[PDB]
C-alpha cells in the first residue's frame, strides 16, 4: 500500500500539457473534473483550442 502511494504521488506530480491549476488540491480537482465532464465539453474544448465556432 505504501508503495502504491509513492507511485501515484509520482505520477500525479508528473505534468503533461497545460497547467490549469494553482495548487495540488486544484490539480486533483481539475483531474476529477476532466474524468467526469470531458464527455460533455468536447465541442467547447475544441472551440477554446482553435479559437472559434460554437
Amino acid at each position: 500500500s505504501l508503495k502504491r502511494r509513492r507511485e501515484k504521488l509520482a505520477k500525479s506530480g508528473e505534468e503533461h500539457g497545460d497547467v490549469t491549476y494553482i495548487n495540488e488540491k486544484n490539480k486533483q480537482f481539475n483531474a476529477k473534473l476532466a474524468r467526469f465532464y470531458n464527455k460533455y465539453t468536447a465541442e467547447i474544448r475544441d472551440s477554446f483550442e482553435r479559437g472559434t465556432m460554437v
Binding site: 490549469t20 494553482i22 476529477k32 473534473l33 467526469f36 465532464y37 465539453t41 467547447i44
Partner: protein, 144 residues
C-alpha cells in the same frame, strides 16, 4: 392488554411521572425559602457486617437521621461544571437482511458530478473554462 393491566400500568407510570413533575416544578420555581417545617426524623435499624479487619460480631445499631437545618439566606455552594457526555450503552447487533447485489452500472448510475459553481469559489481554484460552462444550458437554449 386488558383494562386491569392498563390501569395498573397507568397508575405505576402516573406515580413515577408525578414524582418527576414535582421535581421539575420545584426546580423551575425554587420555593422562596428552602427550609421545611416538617423536619421529622427517620430511623434505620442497621445490622452491621463485620469490620475492616475484625470478624467478631458487634452490636446492632439504631440510626436517627434528620435533615440538617440550613441557613435560608445561603446561595448554592458549588459551581457547576461542563463534562462531556458519556459513551452510549453497548450498541446492538445490526440485524440487516442479506446485502443488495449491485452492479458496476448501479455504481456509475449513482456517481455524482463535481459541482462547479458560477458564483462561489471558496478555495480560490482556477477552473478550466469548459468545466465552468459545462452546467450552463444557455448553450443548449434554442430560439424559434
Amino acid at each position: 392488554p386488558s383494562k386491569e393491566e392498563v390501569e395498573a400500568t397507568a397508575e405505576r407510570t402516573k406515580n413515577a411521572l408525578a414524582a418527576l413533575v414535582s421535581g421539575a416544578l420545584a426546580a423551575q420555581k425554587p420555593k422562596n425559602v428552602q427550609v421545611n417545617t416538617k423536619r421529622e426524623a427517620t430511623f434505620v435499624k442497621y445490622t452491621p457486617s463485620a469490620q475492616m479487619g475484625n470478624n467478631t460480631k458487634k452490636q446492632e445499631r439504631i440510626i436517627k437521621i434528620v435533615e440538617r437545618q440550613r441557613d435560608p439566606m445561603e446561595p448554592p455552594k458549588f459551581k457547576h461544571k461542563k463534562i462531556p457526555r458519556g459513551p452510549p450503552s453497548p450498541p446492538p447487533p445490526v440485524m440487516h437482511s442479506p446485502p443488495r447485489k449491485l452492479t458496476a452500472e448501479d455504481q456509475e448510475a449513482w456517481r455524482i458530478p463535481p459541482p462547479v459553481s458560477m458564483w462561489k469559489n471558496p478555495k480560490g481554484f482556477t477552473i478550466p473554462l469548459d468545466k465552468r460552462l459545462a452546467a450552463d444550458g444557455r448553450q443548449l437554449q434554442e430560439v424559434q
